Design an enzyme around this catalytic site. Sequence first.
Site: not given
Ligand SMILES: [Cu+]
Ligand SMILES: [Zn+2]
Lengths: 153, 153
Positions: B46, B48, B63, B71, B80, B83, B120, B143
């Site tokens: 994603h 951020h 995010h 999410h 988001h 995403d 992630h 992360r």
């Molecule tokens: Cu993320």
């Molecule tokens: Zn998200």
Amino acid sequence: ATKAVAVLKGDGPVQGIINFEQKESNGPVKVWGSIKGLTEGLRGFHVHEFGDNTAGCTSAGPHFNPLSRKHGGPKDEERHVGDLGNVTADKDGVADVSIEDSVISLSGDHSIIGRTLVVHEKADDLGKGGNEESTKTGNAGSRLACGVIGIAQ
Amino acid sequence: ATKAVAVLKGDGPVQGIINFEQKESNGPVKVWGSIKGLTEGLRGFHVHEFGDNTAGCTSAGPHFNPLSRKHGGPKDEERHVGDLGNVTADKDGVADVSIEDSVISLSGDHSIIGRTLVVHEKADDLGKGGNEESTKTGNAGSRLACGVIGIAQ
Ligand SMILES: [Cu+]
Ligand SMILES: [Zn+2]
Ligand SMILES: [Cu+]
Ligand SMILES: [Zn+2]
């Protein structure tokens, strides 16, 4: 944005963090932070066009110059938008940066968000050098460290 | 502008280069590249909110989500802006990324320029989990690597 940050890193010992703050739309921008691992003295400091680190600091390209002007010092009207002159490293190799500039911006056409901040090996001659390169890069030389300018909280 | 890039790096072996391209101002954004050093399987992917790497990928914040939505997966109505679901690492730990998204952009309110791309530790459950964390991070965990998204053209 109103706040931004650039984490400077390179292939050598030079590293640091530079913060950007612009409380008003297209208003003056405060630039402050510290860079360590430098050699005492003046070192070029500019915003380069691309926030592209695929090839280290070289892929950042030339100085951000949307108005197609010659290289100069930050106080000069004839300068690249990314021309922030020089920072000064102390005898301990640390350059505490505290600049205010009204040409760069954190929004709009002259926004530096997503571009690259670079600190150089040599002093920027501010376009007053006795050669053709002076009005291109100020003869700042190698890019010791750089970081993409990102949006900060 | 029309092209952006993010160089992913972390504290471990995870590394990669992800390219972004948006032909038209309101057209889809093509996302492609490769990520290595990953454990075979699904890994959250994603954008951020902050392009801040002062304290590693933790500094990127949550995010990217301008209007505080929940999410979701990239194909979910509720998600988001940042995403992008999961990337899938193969037996050799490499994830070949080739996606097209209609929500992220390289300009305007949804612009990801100056923000951070993160990959992630665990899989993104696409917000369908029976817990509140699912609706925030998809339970993707830590992360592994991240990089500020910069202008590349
Ligand atoms: Cu993320
Ligand atoms: Zn998200
Ligand atoms: Cu420079
Ligand atoms: Zn210049």
